[PDB]
Amino acid sequence: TRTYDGDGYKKRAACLCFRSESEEEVLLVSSSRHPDRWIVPGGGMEPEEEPSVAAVREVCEEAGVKGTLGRLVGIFENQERKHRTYVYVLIVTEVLEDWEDSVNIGRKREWFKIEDAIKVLQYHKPVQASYFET
Numbered sequence: 298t299r300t301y302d303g304d305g306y307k308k309r310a311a312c313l314c315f316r317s318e319s320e321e322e323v324l325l326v327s328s329s330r331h332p333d334r335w336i337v338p339g340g341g342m343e344p345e346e347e348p349s350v351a352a353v354r355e356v357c358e359e360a361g362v363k364g365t366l367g368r369l370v371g372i373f374e375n376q377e378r379k380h381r382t383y384v385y386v387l388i389v390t391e392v393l394e395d396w397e398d399s400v401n402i403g404r405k406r407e408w409f410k411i412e413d414a415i416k417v418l419q420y421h422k423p424v425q426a427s428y429f430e431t
């Protein structure tokens with residue numbers, strides 16, 4: 298069930314999934330609609346779902362990782378697609394081999410150095426590239 302803010306923007310949550318506390322490598326996943334494109338794992342909040350809970354849940358479903366939830370980075374709007382995303386830090390401590398989106402849609406995941414993550418996000422996902430600007 299999709300949920301919305303009072304202005305009609307779709308509510309989403311995402312994590313910057315870092316390999317370690319040094320925050321030098323981040324995990325991206327392939328797009329479901331376009332599999333040669335990279336995105337930050339995230340998705341819609343469910344009804345009455347805390348943003349931090351949605352963020353951890355979506356990363357588990359899309360990226361097959363668990364870890365230590367850190368800071369809220371910020372709340373980011375995409376004006377073109379009318380959605381508003383709470384973005385958290387997650388320090389990955391568990392990498393599971395066969396996760397919901399790998400099994401169901403063959404979603405891929407890869408570690409990127411921060412500067413390379415920004416590069417691959419810029420063309421189609423400039424707001425997600427901006428998650429890293431802080």
Ligand SMILES: O=P(O)(O)O[C@H]1[C@@H](OP(=O)(O)O)[C@H](OP(=O)(O)O)[C@@H](OP(=O)(O)C(F)(F)P(=O)(O)O)[C@H](OP(=O)(O)O)[C@H]1OP(=O)(O)O
Nearest residue numbers: 299307309327328329330331334336339340341378380421
């Ligand atoms: O993360 P979500 O908010 O679920 O985004 C999910 C959907 O949302 P929904 O599940 O249909 O509500 C996106 O559609 P909208 O951009 O919200 O229309 C999808 O966006 P699209 O409709 O393809 C787009 F934004 F118009 P494009 O990326 O083609 O410019 C998004 O696809 P991406 O993977 O490319 O972000 C999808 O992601 P996924 O299928 O990997 O979950």
Ligand SMILES: [Cl-]
Nearest residue numbers: 317320321322
């Ligand atoms: Cl790291």
Ligand SMILES: [Cl-]
Nearest residue numbers: 375422424425
């Ligand atoms: Cl976006």
Ligand SMILES: [F-]
Nearest residue numbers: 339340341355
């Ligand atoms: F989802």
Ligand SMILES: [Mg+2]
Nearest residue numbers: 339340341355
């Ligand atoms: Mg979704």
Ligand SMILES: [Mg+2]
Nearest residue numbers: 339340341359
């Ligand atoms: Mg998603």
Ligand SMILES: [Mg+2]
Nearest residue numbers: 339340355359
């Ligand atoms: Mg999802």
Ligand SMILES: [Mg+2]
Nearest residue numbers: 340341342355
């Ligand atoms: Mg979802």
